[PDB]
Design a protein around this ligand. Structure first.
Ligand SMILES: *[C@@H]1O[C@H](CO)[C@@H](O)[C@H](O)[C@H]1NC(C)=O
Lengths: 55, 175
């Protein structure tokens, strides 16, 4: 069924690559390749507040 | 109250005593006035301050984000998370409400005990030299000037120094 004028669908995936590791993308079609990644260091705790209260 | 002094055999408090929680009221030829017993008041302030700090400081928490997010097929764990949040709420609400109720009763009792003990200390000092006229008051059988008053409020009352003068006045008035 059409959602935003689209009868097709697109699934989104993610993964965390450990330092020094290799990630391989291989396809014959239908792949939405990454362009920008993010090198990051996670903290411990915190969450997501959903509110209209201003920062 | 529990010790019978505050709102008991001492019916009311003193608005004219501003320097402490418990104290004395005196009257003699030189006038009248109010003075707090600094020793007992300072002990109560130390105890009540410690009581407040204990109730607050024993609550030490760690960094924590309570909230969790679950999708439409994770309803059971969403309800489990809700059960945990509600269970802590009920435990903390119930304990906090009751702790305040019980500690307020003990605090009012504690003040009642201090007033009771202060009266008993004076009564044990004065003995025959004064008459208990009620309402936490003593009426001396001998003139008690400002210096004599200071001895009582300081716990340094000399019973034998006035014992014979009080004895003569006590024995006549009772004759
Ligand atoms: C009050 O009593 C204390 C008891 O230690 C005594 O040292 C002090 O000298 C007394 N006060 C006066 C003014 O004598």
């Amino acid at each position: 069924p059409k959602v935003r004028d689209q009868e097709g669908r697109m699934n989104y995936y993610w993964t965390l690559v450990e330092p020094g590791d290799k990630i391989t993308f291989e396809a014959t079609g239908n792949l939405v390749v990454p362009r920008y990644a993010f090198a990051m260091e996670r903290n411990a705790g915190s969450g997501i507040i959903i509110s209209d209260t201003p920062v | 109250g529990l010790f019978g002094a505050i709102a008991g055999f001492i019916e009311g408090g003193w608005t004219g005593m501003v320097d402490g929680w418990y104290g004395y009221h005196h009257q003699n030829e030189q006038g009248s006035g109010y003075a707090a017993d600094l020793k007992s008041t300072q002990n109560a302030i130390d105890g009540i301050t410690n009581k407040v700090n204990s109730v607050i400081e024993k609550m030490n928490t760690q960094f924590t984000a309570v909230g969790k997010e679950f999708n439409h097929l994770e309803k059971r764990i969403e309800n489990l998370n809700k059960k945990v949040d509600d269970g802590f709420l009920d435990i903390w609400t119930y304990n906090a409400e009751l702790l305040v109720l019980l500690e307020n009763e003990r605090t009012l009792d504690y003040h009642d005990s201090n007033v009771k003990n202060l009266y008993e200390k004076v009564r044990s000092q004065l003995k025959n030299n004064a008459k208990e006229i009620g309402n936490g008051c003593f009426e001396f059988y001998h003139k008690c000037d400002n210096t004599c008053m200071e001895s009582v409020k300081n716990g340094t009352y000399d019973y034998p120094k006035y014992s014979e003068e009080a004895k003569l006045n006590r024995e006549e008035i009772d004759s």
